[PDB]
């Protein structure tokens, strides 16, 4: 996008800094499905692929108004002492283009069991003879643990960043604010 | 001259349980039949507490007890050097008193540090602070807890009028009951953080509550005094200063910044380090251990 934000985390020994994070994805998630749109995207730029970390500093991808849109906002308070902000800068040039993306696997496949039973109604040994647990993949992408509101579960939603392009074109955020189509500058 | 080979200290300011009762916002002056938050079991199992469908506020009931006398050990061998350690903490105590260690510990009270998962993300959180002398309450505190950051202790009058009641149970001079209440405006249907067993929430019956020490290592969190960087903060006083969440050993014995270290240079060689090493040396010595072989 046009401008960015990038916020650093405070240096916390009391709580580990992957917990920070993910508060902070967790007010960013219930931030965009409070507000709402679908160019809001996410850029982590200390991306250590070979440890698969994200970092100690993340950048918000929208434009002005939606900014300081953002910052006028009392999702801002209680955690002004455990976080630096940043300012609406303009995008350098020129900066390649990647992605972010929630990669979701069948990691253990008691659901794809209930879910074929659910559909099939069939015997709970078609279910076993039918797909093992072989299918279960793994994963070496950067995760995030998050919570819920309704259905509380602590979950690891994966964070896996494409390709480095050259030309962003026309592409939405979800309500994650995760790479549908929309590009990122990677700077 | 040398150490004993085995000396032990009983703990002063003995924290108590804390258990957890729910309600809404506005009856924060007429608390007193809250129904509490009870455990409930979904699905492996896994044990799960949840906040009420109509309260967004949360009552953490404990309760604080102020003994003195921090010098005496519990056990000791050889009296040379337990004498030696009494006069050593006599010209401490009549050179300063406990009023920096009272200021840190009532700055670190009035600040809601003790619900520790459940203190982010909160609309408006604030403690009460009765002094219980008889059956009946004698003084009141009130503080916002919003107001003192977790980064700095502060300056203010109520804090240094708590300040000089924790003083004046340090010294030996009095006895000190305190009845903490904090409030917590978070929201409903919420879940709440109690201690976790070895999975199961730690419980009073039928309550979710919290445990002692948990509340004990949050109230000494006072250590702002680490050799190698100091915008970590304050730090729960520890010989071997470290942090289980962290995992580093800051005052390590390279250094000459470990506990032990400077209590057989303060004792045996005779060399009194800085002040402020000293107010560490008193909080270790506060929170109490074993030590000699």
């Known amino acids: ?187 | 001259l040398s150490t004993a080979s085995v000396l032990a200290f009983e703990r002063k300011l003995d924290p108590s349980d804390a258990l957890m009762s729910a309600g809404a916002w506005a009856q924060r002056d007429a608390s007193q039949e809250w129904p509490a938050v009870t455990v409930r079991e979904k699905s492996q199992t896994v044990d799960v507490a949840n906040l009420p469908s109509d309260a967004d506020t949360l009552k953490v009931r404990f309760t604080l007890r102020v003994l003195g006398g921090a010098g005496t050990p519990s056990a000791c061998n050889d009296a040379a050097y337990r004498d030696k350690l009494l006069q050593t903490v006599a010209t401490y105590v009549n050179e300063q008193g406990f009023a920096e260690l009272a200021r840190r510990y009532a700055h670190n009270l009035a600040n809601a540090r003790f619900l520790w998962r459940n203190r982010v993300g909160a609309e408006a959180v604030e403690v009460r602070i009765n002094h219980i002398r008889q059956g009946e309450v004698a003084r009141t505190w009130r503080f916002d807890a919003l107001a003192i950051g977790l980064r700095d202790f502060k300056a203010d009058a109520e804090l240094d009028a708590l300040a000089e009641l924790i003083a004046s149970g340090l010294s030996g001079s009095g006895h000190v009951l305190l009845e903490v209440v904090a409030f917590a405006r978070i929201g409903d249907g919420q879940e709440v953080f109690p201690s976790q067993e070895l999975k199961t929430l730690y419980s009073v019956r039928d309550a979710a509550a919290i445990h002692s020490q948990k509340i004990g290592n949050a109230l000494r969190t006072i250590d702002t005094w680490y050799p190698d960087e100091d915008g970590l903060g304050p730090i729960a006083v520890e010989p071997y200063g470290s942090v289980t969440s962290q995992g580093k050993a800051y005052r390590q014995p390279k250094q000459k910044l470990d506990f032990y270290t400077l209590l057989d240079n303060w004792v045996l060689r005779d060399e009194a380090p800085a002040v402020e090493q000293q107010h560490y040396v008193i909080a270790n010595l506060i929170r109490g251990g074993v030590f000699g072989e």
Not at chain 1, 35 to 52: K, Y
Not at chain 1, 89 to 111: D, W
Not at chain 1, 165 to 176: K, R, S
């Open chain 1, 1 to 187: 996008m046009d401008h960015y934000l990038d916020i650093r985390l405070r240096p916390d020994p009391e709580f580990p800094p992957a917990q920070l994070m993910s508060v902070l994805f967790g007010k960013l998630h219930q931030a965009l499905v409070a507000q709402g749109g679908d160019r809001i995207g996410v850029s982590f730029p200390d991306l250590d692929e070979s440890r698969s970390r994200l970092g100690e500093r993340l950048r918000i991808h929208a434009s002005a108004d939606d900014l300081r849109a953002l910052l006028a906002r009392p999702w801002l308070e209680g955690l002004r002492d455990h976080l630096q902000f940043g300012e609406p800068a303009v995008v350098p040039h020129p900066t390649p283009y990647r992605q972010v993306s929630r990669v979701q696997a069948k990691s253990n496949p008691e659901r794809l069991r209930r879910r074929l039973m659910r559909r099939h109604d069939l015997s709970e040994e078609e279910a076993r003879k039918r797909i093992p647990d072989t299918v279960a993949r793994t994963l070496d992408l950067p995760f995030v643990t998050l919570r819920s509101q309704s259905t509380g579960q602590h979950f690891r939603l994966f964070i896996r960043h494409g390709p480095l392009q050259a030309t962003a074109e026309e592409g939405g955020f979800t309500c994650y604010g995760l790479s549908k189509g929309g590009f990122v500058p990677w700077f």
